[PDB]
């Protein structure tokens, strides 16, 4: 706690003190675990938040405090005025959460997709019953009929009745079109906190457990530890979807119920099997149906937009990074000062064209172009029902979407408000689209053999 | 005094309407029960000097806090009582499928003389198939047919349900509704909070702090204007359990193997016998919990569902008036009750108790219990005075069953009877008897 | 005179602590804070007495504490107060459901019809499956008596047999909130619990117990050799392939599927029944099932208690007012030492698993970090336990040295990649027996 003990209350000049104090933060912040990094310009509060001041005495030394807490939201800001005793000014010091996010890391259980063909394995006694356990490889299924040689439908010198077998073993050929994960790690919080003064930017990590005491600023991070990042996922084509999907080795109806781990394709059902006559030759085994495969019904997974992937080797790192994560608390005590927090007004054009139907699976789609001249945080609100509450507009893209369900029916004219910009946006009603392969498959291949 | 606390009752009052707040009617039966935790202090602008207090409260439903606001060395000037109206989360679903038990089953079939079964059965959309070779043999014949160990027997079927439940899909994410208000001098200023954008008057100023997280399940039943959970099937899933037979727009889809066989004619074409078309597991539809945290909106097509009861941050506030000196209050609370509880051990359906509670003011109480009750709190109203509470008693109960609502500790009256019995859990080998 | 004003001022804390509703207990050496947080000091009057609180605001998490060192105004010391968070968990109880396991037996009973159709409705005991075949009379398949050709029926019923080696819980309470804090001075404690509604106001000293009331505790539970596993498990009444769609509830075991049924023809005997499966009973795939490491079981007759006590459940804010006096917050140095074994794969589904020895002097409640992606992101050091145990993902592949970091001690862990364990019992059961009658 040694950069506290300079004491810079008093000095004739007010670019040397200005620059004095510049230093004193500086070097404050970086003796301590911030890093320098690239100022970003367009970051300004947009808010006020609620403020606690006061004044520590210690030696010979007074410091004044100011104290204020806001949500853990990524491209969140406060700002600081620093001034001394009614002298003005000295710095303005600005308060972003750069990063506000939680992940996890998954472990590939098993690919999976549709049936394309069936490899059967068969034979036929012509006298005996079945064998009591039918040999198969690994993962296939096995199919039998008893008292399959009758007059009539015999092979080559049979002459038993009511009496014989066929059996055999089959297994699906799929073709892989996705991949399912499964939740290895609990959830875990990066919120990454800067300043900017003077043209210069110290950022930061936070810990729910250990608060960051420097001597001139302190930050503590407030959450409760409750996330749910879903303990299953799909991943198809770089794209992240969640539903209804299989554990690895479970077989129930639904997406991913035919799985591929490591060399082999498991999976389960009933075989559709039976067999054609011949009088001198040997019967003909038909398969329609060998493993039960629901694949279609991955199609009907939701596709969430509040998530990202960072795919690696086998393994599926997952991203939230749009939600209010908890509260972080902040008290600046500069030295002997005066504090007056300020942020700014946001100014926003914007456009928006949407397009979807009532009552169906895909409800409302909007497009939106949304220029601002500052990054801000946005609320935003709407007569029907919007999915994500929220919206952070950057300088940087121009193009942003968000989509919707609405309770009653909605016009041409359809209102959205982004901050104190209130959007009416041009909406078409396309009729709901048609549903397709709901249904599930009776059979996969016709196999004759 | 009555000259300047009018000043500080419409110098507030119109601080507060300047900004979004809206006048309701002051109730005065909510009261605080409770004080909390409070930082005073005294900011200056310019020349005037305002004295703040800081104080924060849970935000949930029937909380409230007390404020006294004084003259400096005198007493009393005004009470300002903060009471949290709405604590609420919710989200809107999409209709995904009808559901019920199957009353029939439609079928369609086909014979063949000669030759083996179609490579690929025709059917009608979310229709089954079934078929049999070798259909032709002996004394099982149609009329001219003389094949034996030939020919085929091939269907469709569909089941045919009675729609006596509804499933929907959490289709919007989840947000928070908390309403906040204030009263003086029997007018009263209520306002919406937002996680993002503090309200920040000159006078008062509130800053709702929480964390994005909220359990509302993905996909809910309706059944008879109830809200049923459990595992319930999403759209386009056969897995067996509730929900696999799915009525989605106008056809009635399902998955399973047809329980199919046939009965043999002389001179006649063959009957068909269906025992079984779709699994359908309708009954499991019936051991869904039913969760009393939340409350429905029906839309057609689409059902808005509401957490009320729970707590979703902390409501911070600043109050900053003037040349003033604060002192909180909370009022006590009185309560009577009585109880009367039933139910078993061991079982599903556990125990249910029926309290009488009257209460003066309104209060949010925590109830404590020697046996874990299902909710840790509850609200008592001068409103209704019969409430409602379950509980799970590991060990097992006598006469004397102890609850506890606020500071009233109740003895309620426990009568044990047997558990209810298990009907319907067997699944259906056989959904009706098809012969034609 | 500053003795008796410390023992003046103990007592007066300690009669305000033990006229509400702290407990006393057995003062603890090993809890020493090893953190310093923010702190708003001030002073607040109450007629002709002035008192001086400090307020500061701390996680609710178990083992987290935080030092004040009070001092008389120019003079020190006085007395040292530590604000201990002793339990931070939440917490709801489950009735049983069913139990489940794997499949030894199968039994069955079936009837037989020289003519006539199959009955229109077969007679079954509960839970039991029917089956039944037209046609069984044909030519070469008889028992005696029997004239008819392409005609008459076999019927049946059948359960399997199951040995009951797990079972199923459903949640049927709401999560609560159990938190539990004390303050030790002058080798005295005093505990309490703690409420979010409720605050706790002392004369000298206040608590406020904030949090969001959102918890996940599964709602399904798997009880194994009194472990807890989670995962897919099927509801009551369930039978959807996986783990528990055989339920064996109250007296009479039910499940579903399509029992695979056939017959044998005899000429001087009546007809031998085949039945190779029954239900379907996939009790394999609960060998797949997670077993979480942040939960611990309470069993009682019917009925188990799941605890989460890992967490972070909200923040504890605390204003003491001991009167005219000055405060200074600490917290200690934690020294620690260590040692790691670490041993997994990579790309599989174990993962790697590291054994650490862990000694400290003081409860310590520790982030963790390291290069890979480790399971929970801290580790709670206390001087009773000396060994714990931690997981990682890494998604690179480690060499000999693994380093992990346990509060500020860093920790060269002996890493050795071991092959994937082979993957077994993935596939079903086509045939649960061989029964022949
Ligand atoms: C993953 O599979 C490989 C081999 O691939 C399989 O090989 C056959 C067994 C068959 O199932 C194919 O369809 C697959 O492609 C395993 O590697 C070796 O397998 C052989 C089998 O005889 C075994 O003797 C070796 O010990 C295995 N190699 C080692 C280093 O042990 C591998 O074990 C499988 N991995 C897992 C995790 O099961
Ligand atoms: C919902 O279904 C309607 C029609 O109902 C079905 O129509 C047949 C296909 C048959 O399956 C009936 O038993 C059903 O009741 C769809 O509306 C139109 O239906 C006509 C029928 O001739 C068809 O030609 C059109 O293509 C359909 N669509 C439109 C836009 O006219 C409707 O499309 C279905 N809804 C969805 C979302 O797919
Ligand atoms: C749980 O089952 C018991 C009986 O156990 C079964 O009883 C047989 C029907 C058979 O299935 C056995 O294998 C089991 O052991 C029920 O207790 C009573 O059982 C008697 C049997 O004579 C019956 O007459 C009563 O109606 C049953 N009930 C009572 C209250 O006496 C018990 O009811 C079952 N519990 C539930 C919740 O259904």
């Not at 990063?99 to 690919?111: C, H, R, W």
């Given at each position: 706690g040694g950069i506290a003990k300079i004491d810079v209350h008093n000095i004739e000049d007010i670019e040397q003190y200005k620059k004095a104090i510049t230093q004193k933060l500086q070097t404050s912040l970086s003796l301590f675990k911030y890093a320098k990094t690239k100022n970003l310009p367009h970051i300004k509060p947009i808010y006020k938040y609620i403020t606690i001041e006061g004044t520590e005495?210690?030696?010979?030394?007074?410091?004044?405090?100011?104290?204020?807490?806001?949500?853990?939201?990524?491209?969140?800001?406060?700002?600081?005025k620093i001034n001394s005793k009614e002298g003005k000014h000295l710095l303005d010091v600005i308060a972003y959460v750069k990063?506000?996010?939680?992940?996890?890391?998954?472990?590939?259980?098993?690919?999976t997709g549709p049936t394309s063909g069936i490899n059967t394995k068969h034979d036929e006694l012509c006298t005996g019953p079945c064998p009591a356990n039918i040999n198969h490889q690994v993962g296939w299924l096995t199919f039998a009929r008893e008292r399959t040689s009758s007059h009539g439908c015999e092979e080559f010198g049979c002459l038993a009745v009511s009496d014989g077998c066929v059996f055999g073993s089959c297994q699906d050929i799929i073709k892989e079109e996705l991949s399912v994960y499964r939740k290895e790690t609990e959830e875990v919080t990066d919120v990454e906190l800067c300043l900017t003064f003077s043209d210069k930017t110290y950022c930061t990590n936070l810990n729910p457990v250990t608060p960051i005491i420097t001597d001139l600023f302190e930050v503590q991070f407030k959450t409760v530890e409750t996330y749910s990042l879903p303990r299953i996922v799909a991943v198809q084509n770089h794209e992240i979807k969640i539903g209804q999907i299989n554990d690895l080795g479970v077989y129930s109806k639904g997406c991913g119920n035919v799985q591929k781990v490591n060399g082999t394709i498991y999976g389960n059902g009933v075989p559709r099997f039976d067999y054609?006559?011949?009088?001198?030759?040997?019967?003909?085994?038909?398969?329609?149906?060998c493993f039960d495969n629901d694949y279609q019904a991955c199609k009907f997974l939701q596709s969430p937009a509040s998530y990202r992937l960072e795919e690696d080797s086998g393994t599926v790192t997952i991203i939230d990074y749009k939600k209010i994560l908890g509260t972080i608390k902040m008290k600046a005590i500069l030295g002997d000062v005066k504090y007056k927090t300020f942020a700014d007004s946001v100014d926003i054009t914007a456009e928006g064209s949407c397009t979807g139907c009532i009552?169906?699976?895909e409800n409302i789609h909007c497009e939106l172009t949304l220029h601002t001249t500052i990054e801000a945080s946005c609320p935003i609100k709407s007569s029907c029902t919007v999915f994500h509450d929220r919206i952070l507009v950057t300088p940087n893209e121009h193009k942003y979407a968000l989509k919707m369900v609405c309770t009653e029916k909605p016009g041409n004219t359809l209102t959205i408000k982004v901050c104190n910009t209130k959007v009416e946006a041009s909406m078409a009603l396309v009729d709901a689209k048609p549903i397709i392969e709901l249904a599930p498959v009776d059979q996969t291949a016709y196999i004759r053999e």
């Open positions: 005495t210690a030696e010979g030394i007074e410091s004044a405090y100011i104290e204020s807490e806001v949500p853990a939201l990524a491209g969140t800001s406060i700002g600081f990063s506000a996010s939680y992940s996890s890391v998954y472990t590939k259980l098993y690919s054609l006559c011949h009088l001198a030759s040997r019967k003909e085994v038909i398969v329609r149906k009552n169906c699976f």
